């Protein structure tokens, strides 16, 4: 399977991706991805057990989570693969990503409600069910709470960082993982969440289908880092309380380790790396 830049999909590929996501929503499967993500975003803490985020396993955990999602999509339409959103390149509200034939656009100014595209509440096809408040409609405020998406030069400054992660292996860390996650430095991944706004800025962010495309590009950046730093590798490598060491298994699956996910080519390649 090849993961393609969203910008490059044909109209038929976009149609088939949208249909597969809507069918996962209709069948009830989609919402359980939202719920799983929320359970870890709430339970992972800097001073305690941490697996899905704020920790070295942020990257292999999301790699496995995205594979689970892509396998669910392929169970609906075997031709579909997960595309990625290069937010350094496709960085305005006018990008084809946000067109009505793909994800739809920003929210209206009164309540943030997305009014167009396949995921607009008015279609009846995108109920927000896993939620933290009464509102059941997709919301966005593109560029509302932060000025700009990261640039290619900001991304390259993070790719340059040679340590994968460093003690204390949490949101206070130096090193590549925490600069890509964005809790320190120029801020890549967290800032994209803030830029989209609406559910993407919350603890139920997979409610927006752009979640997966954003995380597929974060996953590509890990792969790019690995080629830049062939002698650097996942850490820690054993005996770290509360943190997933390289050969420890990860929740919720329990049957996979970071070690099993370092080499993405076992599962997919990129259009260009």
């Amino acid at each position: 399977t090849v993961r393609k830049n969203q910008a490059t999909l044909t109209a038929d590929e976009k149609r088939r991706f949208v249909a597969a996501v809507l069918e996962l929503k209709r069948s009830g499967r989609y919402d359980e991805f939202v719920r799983t993500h929320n359970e870890f975003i709430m339970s992972d803490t800097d001073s305690g057990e941490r697996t899905g985020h704020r920790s070295p396993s942020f990257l292999p955990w999301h790699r496995r989570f995205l594979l689970d999602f892509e396998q669910a999509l392929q169970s609906v339409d075997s031709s579909v693969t997960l595309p990625y959103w290069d937010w350094s390149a496709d960085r305005t509200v006018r990008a084809s990503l946000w067109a009505p034939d793909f994800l739809g656009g920003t929210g209206r100014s009164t309540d943030g409600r997305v009014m167009d595209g396949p995921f607009a509440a008015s279609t009846g096809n995108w109920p927000i069910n896993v939620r933290v408040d009464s509102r059941t409609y997709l919301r966005r405020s593109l560029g509302g709470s932060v000025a700009e998406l990261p640039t290619r030069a900001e991304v390259e400054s993070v790719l340059a960082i040679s340590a994968y992660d460093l003690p204390p292996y949490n949101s206070a860390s130096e090193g590549f993982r925490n600069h890509l996650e964005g809790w320190r430095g120029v801020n890549l991944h967290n800032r994209v969440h803030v830029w989209v706004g609406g559910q993407m800025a919350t603890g139920v962010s997979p409610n927006d289908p752009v979640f997966w495309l954003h995380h597929a590009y974060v996953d590509k950046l890990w792969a790019e880092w690995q080629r830049r730093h062939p002698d650097s590798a996942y850490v820690p490598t054993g005996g770290t309380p509360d943190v997933v060491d390289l050969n420890e298994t990860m929740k919720p699956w329990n049957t996979v380790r970071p070690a099993d996910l370092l080499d993405h080519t076992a599962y997919y390649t990129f259009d260009a790396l």
């Binding site: 929320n38 975003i41 709430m42 803490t45 800097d46 001073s47 704020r54 309540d111 943030g112 939620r131 933290v132 408040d133 009464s134 509102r135 709470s145 932060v146 204390p168 949490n170 949101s171 206070a172 964005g182 809790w183 967290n190 800032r191 969440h193 803030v194 800025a201 919350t202 603890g203 139920v204 962010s205």
Partner: protein, 72 residues
């Protein structure tokens, strides 16, 4: 030491915080919040944009909710 407790009406909603690590409520409904290692705070309504205090997290949540009742 945990931050101090607080109780105020903000944008027409009662927001409360108290050490437990720390609990916040919006109109009596608990808002999940979390403290980062640097002392900043986030919540399940605004998770990716750290703010300096638990009251700032409660206010950011009320701002984002735009009047919507929080769900447990």
């Amino acid at each position: 030491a945990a931050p101090e407790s607080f109780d105020e009406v903000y944008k027409g909603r009662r927001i409360q915080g108290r050490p437990a690590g720390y609990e916040v409520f919006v109109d009596g409904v608990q808002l999940h919040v979390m403290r980062n290692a640097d002392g900043s705070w986030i919540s399940v309504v605004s998770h990716y944009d750290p703010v300096p205090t638990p009251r700032a997290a409660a206010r950011a949540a009320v701002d984002e909710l735009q009047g919507a009742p929080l769900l447990p």
